């Protein structure tokens, strides 16, 4: 069977680079049941905190390269290397909040504290999986610490993530009020991003050309170097696969996967042992 | 003699899609710094600018948009965009109509034919010290008539907050005529539009437009040629009646055109007649 490409742009040429759609497993169209978005929206007001009186800013004159940049300090450092990327010493198992630099510093919008801002880089691919329905592949080698992309869709709040009825794509920003993204109806390339036992990228909670705490945008940055045609995929919380185990198990394929029906299966025999 | 000095090698630090030098070989004054340079408008206080997705009027267009189908065309009345990015030439420069880019929720494609204002400045354009009236922007290359120039950005600001405030030399009103009343104050927070002078033989034209949201309460103003322009004109547009009708007192038009209004001569043989 081929492996045809049956969209040039899933993202309609809203980001930096095209991100084509193949399918070499089954007949299963170009997904369409969802808007593709580049930036989060949202369908009710939640009218996002822009007064740029109220952004923290820095006043470097450099290249934001300094350990005095005020964005960096307010990061903790700037997480950045000179290449853009995660310094190695990154916290990976809880990362910290990242602010860039915005419209009220000083700098220039090329500094060194703009990663996420600038948008994707990397050669993404919408892609048929075995077993998982769509996923997300490299289609270049991917360094370590690198942006992939942002975890874009609809801003909702909690309160109305309870009442709706699919959470296949809602991510919890886990804040003052809880709010989070649903990006089943609105979302862009992220929302086909699998989860993996074996995970190769993290999410990171970053502020941009706001910093309304309410909203945090979620980046999703590479935590191991990555090889050309990898499946892209983080670890979605066992909060997730605790609801989920119930009516479909894990089909990462991993040799530690968690959440199989195989694992599930094998820890209720431990237990009853027990 | 003195000679000219690039003082600037860029106003807006990059968030331009080209650089915008500034030069002075005039007078001695500085690169112009009692302001922030902004490439898109800013709010010091909640505008509450409606951006529910589901509020956008979007078309169904597959094709660039250039058919009579697009309904972003027809709240336009049309799409006033020819294959270049450029306003036809019948465009109603006098009155002209609301534009309505294609949008987030149009099924088109980002590089369609209706996106002009929102791709951003693309003409080579130069903050430079003139003899008369200050800073202006002059072209840096030729401009064929119809070419977007750039955006009057600048703070948004109500009705209320503009009576208050004392320097209105960079308050752009956006003339609402039926709703809310807002303005653009490019006191403190604009881009290279605060520096555009008046010309009585104006040479840009702003025309009202809509991209990322519909809140007609909150157009955003956009310059684009009324003629062909050569390398080094100062480009300018005109402030309005009711601006000189104010500021001939304390100043007079400098612009020098064989058709000025507003010049000292203009206002004497006007009153003689
Ligand atoms: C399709 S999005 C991936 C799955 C989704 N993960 C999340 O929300 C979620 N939030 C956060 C993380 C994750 C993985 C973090 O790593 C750290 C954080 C960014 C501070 C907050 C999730 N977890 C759920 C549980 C119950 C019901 C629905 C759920 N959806
Ligand atoms: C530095 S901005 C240039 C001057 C500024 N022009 C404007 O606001 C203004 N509005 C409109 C235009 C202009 C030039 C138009 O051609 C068409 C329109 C967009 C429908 C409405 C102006 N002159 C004023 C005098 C007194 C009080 C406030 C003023 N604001
Ligand atoms: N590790 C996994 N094992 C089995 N199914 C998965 C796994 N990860 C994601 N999925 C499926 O994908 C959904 C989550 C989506 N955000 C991912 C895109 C999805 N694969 C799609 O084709 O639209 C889940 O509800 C599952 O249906
Ligand atoms: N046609 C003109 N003749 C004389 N002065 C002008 C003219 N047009 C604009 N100005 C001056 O420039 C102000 C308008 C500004 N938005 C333009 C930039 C200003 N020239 C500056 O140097 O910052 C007016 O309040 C005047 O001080
Ligand atoms: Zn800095
Ligand atoms: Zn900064
Ligand atoms: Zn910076
Ligand atoms: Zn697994
Ligand atoms: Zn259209
Ligand atoms: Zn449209
Ligand atoms: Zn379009
Ligand atoms: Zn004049």
Redesign the interface.
Known sequence: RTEKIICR?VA???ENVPIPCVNGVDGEPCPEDY?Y???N???????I?????HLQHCTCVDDCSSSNCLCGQLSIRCWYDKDGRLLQEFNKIEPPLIFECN??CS????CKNRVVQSGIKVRLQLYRTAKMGWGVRALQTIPQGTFICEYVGELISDAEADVREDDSYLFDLDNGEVYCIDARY?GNISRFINHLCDPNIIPVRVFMLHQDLRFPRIAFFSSRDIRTGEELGFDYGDRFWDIKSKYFTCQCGSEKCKHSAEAIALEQSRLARL
């Not at 929206?41 to 009218?47: A, K, L, P």
């Not at 905190?49 to 009186?53: K, Q």
């Not at 700098?107 to 090329?110: D, S």
């Open positions: 742009d309609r040429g809203y808007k978005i580049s930036e929206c949202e369908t009710s007001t939640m009218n905190d822009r007064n740029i009186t419209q009220a700098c220039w919008r090329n609105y």
